[PDB]
């Protein structure tokens with residue numbers, strides 16, 4: 455698993471299930487190229503986004519649709535989405551876990567990077 | 570003001586107002602002695618807990634009554650309180666700001682220490 | 685002051701000083717137009733980005749240059765920047781405070797919205 | 800796994816390995832009774848703290864020795880320890896995951912509670 459995203463709900467104390475996200479990779483003209491996509495499972499996790507061979511050096515953006523998640527719970531949130539922008543694989547392959555902890559007016563994100 | 574506490578509400582996007590907290594200092598017999606207490610203002614801040622003369626070296630604990638805060642909003646939260654335990658003034662007097670960001674199943678705390 | 689940003693450093697226990705950030709507003713053609721920019725003060729705060737007249741309804745993005753901040757401290761951080769994307773003034777003028785807490789592999793952001 | 804604790808390092812982007820913690824349960828005289836103990840594995844996780852039969856209604860405190868963790872990295876941290884105090888099993892058994900994200904001057908904690 456070169457890239458996995460885990461999403462937690464800080465209000466309900468649960469995984470954040472069915473959270474949609476897209477992953478983009480910055481192109482040479484500084485535009486965002488589509489790269490991967492999916493939605494979180496019942497464990498709050500999204501696996502299988504990419505393969506080691508396809509996941510090369512670049513600047514990547516994970517755009518998580520947190521607004522739709524809160525709206526489904528009848529809560530008006532602050533953010534349009536949560537974005538996580540990072541350089542990956544600049545020293546060769548690594549495995550990346552992106553974790554996001556969600557509240558209506560706040561989010562916290564961290565990365566675990568393993569060789 | 571050598572010690573100030575600021576509390577924010579991540580559900581409502583507001584200062585956390587009227588939040589009670591108690592400060593303790595570890596005594597020579599290793600018990601927690603009462604040191605100061607108060608409630609946050611309309612800005613989510615609690616000033617005036619102590620003075621430079623009274624705020625000697627020691628181990629201090631701030632216990633923020635997050636449970637009563639959430640219960641008054643009709644929410645059953647996870648934590649009994651949010652606690653911050655730290656050594657203060659080890660190397661001479663410092664000014665401490667403790668900030669806490671609250672959600673029903675999560676809290677995040679940080680300190681700003683200035684000379 | 686309808687928009688203020690405060691940045692804290694979780695490694696050093698200090699305001700994050702001299703942190704650059706750029707604010708964008710989504711244009712009618714869905715592109716990000718420059719709106720305002722500045723750097724945090726010695727208190728970690730950036731005031732004066734905009735005015736009530738200029739800060740109309742819209743989707744805004746604050747991009748905080750966390751990478752340059754960590755690199756100047758000799759740290760190679762994970763994120764390219766910390767981003768906050770939000771709809772503002774949907775239901776009339778509001779005052780927004782965005783707070784960001786920074787670590788090399790993590791950031792946490794919250795908003796306080798007042799009428 | 801009725802009770803699991805997961806600890807992450809926000810500075811290095813890694814699990815926090817070999818982090819010691821003790822779990823206490825509040826007794827009738829309001830003192831803290833020893834309940835469980837251990838240290839995190841190479842994945843940053845501590846499993847096997849208790850069994851369903853032993854883990855009954857009570858107020859529990861997880862005291863995580865974050866200070867020793869930072870000192871091993873030559874970093875002087877703010878907190879003496881990170882504490883997580885919560886009522887558990889008041890509506891019968893649940894499974895609890897306590898997550899803590901550590902920085903030298905900050906920690907963030909959340910709970911995942913599953914029936």
Ligand SMILES: COc1cc(/C=C/c2ccc(O)cc2)cc(OC)c1
Pocket residue numbers: 465466467526527528580644645646673
């Ligand atoms: C403390 O647990 C909470 C659960 C919830 C659950 C809200 C919710 C809304 C719609 C649903 O379909 C399910 C849960 C909200 C809370 O603060 C707003 C706290």
Ligand SMILES: COc1cc(/C=C/c2ccc(O)cc2)cc(OC)c1
Pocket residue numbers: 562575577666668669670677678679690781783784785792793794796907
């Ligand atoms: C809104 O003004 C403030 C925000 C904050 C935000 C603190 C904070 C704590 C934990 C987090 O995860 C994010 C922000 C701190 C302050 O100390 C003076 C003032």
Ligand SMILES: COc1cc(/C=C/c2ccc(O)cc2)cc(OC)c1
Pocket residue numbers: 695759760761788810811812871872873
């Ligand atoms: C960006 O990754 C970092 C790694 C580290 C690693 C520190 C360290 C110290 C002692 C050790 O034995 C291993 C790592 C520190 C950082 O900011 C202080 C950032």
Ligand SMILES: COc1cc(/C=C/c2ccc(O)cc2)cc(OC)c1
Pocket residue numbers: 460462551553554555562563564677792805807896898899900907908909911
């Ligand atoms: C419950 O299992 C996990 C919890 C967490 C908690 C992450 C987190 C992120 C931000 C915070 O402010 C607090 C915890 C992370 C994980 O990484 C795979 C797994």
Ligand code: NA
Pocket residue numbers: 659660661
């Ligand atoms: Na001393």
Ligand code: NA
Pocket residue numbers: 774775776
């Ligand atoms: Na409107």
